Amino acid sequence: DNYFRIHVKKLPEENKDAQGLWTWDDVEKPSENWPNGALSFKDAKKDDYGYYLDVKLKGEQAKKISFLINNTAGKNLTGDKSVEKLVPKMNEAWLDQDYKVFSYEPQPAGTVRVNYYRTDGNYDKKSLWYWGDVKNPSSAQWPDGTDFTATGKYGRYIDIPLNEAAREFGFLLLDESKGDVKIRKENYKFTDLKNHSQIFLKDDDESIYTNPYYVHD
Numbered sequence: 001d002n003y004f005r006i007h008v009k010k011l012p013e014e015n016k017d018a019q020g021l022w023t024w025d026d027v028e029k030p031s032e033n034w035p036n037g038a039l040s041f042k043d044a045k046k047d048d049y050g051y052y053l054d055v056k057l058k059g060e061q062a063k064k065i066s067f068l069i070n071n072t073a074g075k076n077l078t079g080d081k082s083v084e085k086l087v088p089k090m091n092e093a094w095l096d097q098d099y100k101v102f103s104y105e106p107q108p109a110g111t112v113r114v115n116y117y118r119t120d121g122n123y124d125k126k127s128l129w130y131w132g133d134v135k136n137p138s139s140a141q142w143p144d145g146t147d148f149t150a151t152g153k154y155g156r157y158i159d160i161p162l163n164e165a166a167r168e169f170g171f172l173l174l175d176e177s178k179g180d181v182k183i184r185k186e187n188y189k190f191t192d193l194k195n196h197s198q199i200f201l202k203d204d205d206e207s208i209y210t211n212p213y214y215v216h217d
């Protein structure tokens with residue numbers, strides 16, 4: 001009943017049994033009795049990315065989850081971290097190896113994952129035409145188009161090999177079932193290819209979202 005999932009890429013220290021998750025702010029029972037009142041990583045579950053722990057929210061209207069990883073004596077290993085729910089349904093965050101916090105699972109360096117969600121459909125035959133600061137620019141024969149074939153958490157996706165200190169890229173969402181393929185006529189253009197790793201798109205929405213909740217900023 002109203003948990004928030006915190007994913008951890010790599011624990012600061014070797015033994016999971018000596019480490020725990022100490023939480024405060026909008027959680028039901030803020031940790032007490034430092035350091036042992038923390039939520040132990042001993043019983044942490046694991047997925048593709050690393051460990052995860054689910055924390056019961058003081059909620060609603062729970063909006064700020066603050067946390068750190070500590071050890072049995074008696075260090076604050078990560079420094080203090082906080083996540084703010086972008087929307088009420090935001091229910092997971094990811095901590096990477098440098099203890100940065102994301103609203104999505106971050107992908108390996110030198111890639112941008114382009115996520116595409118359709119309210120309908122369909123999906124087949126949807127593809128991405130892309131260019132600019134990418135290893136393999138669409139080429140080609142208009143209008144195809146790297147197919148949206150893989151399925152993830154946020155609709156379908158394509159992983160794009162970056163190159164360099166990739167800065168900025170452009171793309172068009174394509175519906176190959178059509179006489180007019182473009183979905184949106186005008187070129188999309190994205191900068192922040194350093195500051196992200198995933199982008200989120202949907203339907204014929206003009207906006208390039210930077211979180212899976214399709215809210216601006």
Ligand SMILES: OC[C@H]1O[C@H](O[C@H]2[C@H](O)[C@@H](O)[C@@H](O[C@H]3[C@H](O)[C@@H](O)[C@@H](O[C@H]4[C@H](O)[C@@H](O)[C@@H](O)O[C@@H]4CO)O[C@@H]3CO)O[C@@H]2CO)[C@H](O)[C@@H](O)[C@@H]1O
Pocket residue numbers: 022023024030031034068076080
């Ligand atoms: O309004 C109160 C505060 O609320 C929030 O505090 C957070 C801290 O920022 C977190 O760091 C953590 O605090 C831990 C602390 O990390 C840890 O060291 C420990 O402190 C020990 C100390 O090491 C030791 O020398 C001895 O004196 O015992 C201390 C016991 O306090 O325990 C702290 C928590 O008790 O968690 C708290 C929330 O619980 C907020 O971030 C602050 O801005 C705010 O002032």
Ligand SMILES: OC[C@H]1O[C@H](O[C@H]2[C@H](O)[C@@H](O)[C@@H](O[C@H]3[C@H](O)[C@@H](O)[C@@H](O)O[C@@H]3CO)O[C@@H]2CO)[C@H](O)[C@@H](O)[C@@H]1O
Pocket residue numbers: 129130131138142187
């Ligand atoms: O490849 C990078 C390039 O892709 C996009 O341009 C595409 C056009 O949007 C698309 O209409 C199509 O245009 C070509 C016509 O098919 C053809 O008949 C003739 O008119 O030449 C056109 C070439 O521009 O294909 C291109 C891609 O080849 C994107 O909009 C560009 O900004 C981007 O540079």
Ligand SMILES: [Zn+2]
Pocket residue numbers: 053054
């Ligand atoms: Zn759980």
Ligand SMILES: [Zn+2]
Pocket residue numbers: 127144145146147176
């Ligand atoms: Zn195709």
Ligand SMILES: [Zn+2]
Pocket residue numbers: 192195210
């Ligand atoms: Zn940004």
